[PDB]
């Protein structure tokens, strides 16, 4: 806020100014993989891959 001194302030009122800033997001960060149905009889590698992805 500004300020002004004195008793008489005719025509010396001031408006309100509120600035702003913008926020935005980037491209997603991914993990992506493919498996066949014969490779899921163990699942240990699958779970370890999920945790490593996190």
């Amino acid at each position: 806020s500004p300020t002004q001194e004195g008793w008489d302030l005719t025509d010396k009122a001031t408006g309100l100014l509120e600035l702003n800033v913008a926020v935005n997001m980037g491209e997603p960060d991914n993990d992506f993989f493919q498996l066949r149905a014969d490779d899921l009889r163990d699942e240990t590698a699958y779970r370890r891959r999920i945790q490593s992805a996190a």
Partner: protein
Amino acid sequence: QRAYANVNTSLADAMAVNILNVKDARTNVFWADDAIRIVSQPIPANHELFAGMKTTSFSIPDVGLNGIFATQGDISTLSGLCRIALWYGVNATRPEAIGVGLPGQTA
């Protein structure tokens, strides 16, 4: 408007700029805690991608972020795809509050 002033004068004609990083140096970084924010959102399951995918949430540890774990299966080739996505953006809302420290900047 002058209430927001932050420099004593303005940029006036041929004023020399000085580069302050004159050697390579790993940076030390200080800030006020509210200067860096991380705007994050789970990817909606109605997205054009993740179309035939079954999507659930996925809590990324340590940091307070949640991404999407989406999975799909294929019957022709008895296969499947896993996709872990994370949607976020790091925003510096108070760059005047963020700072950097450059030791050994001998010209």
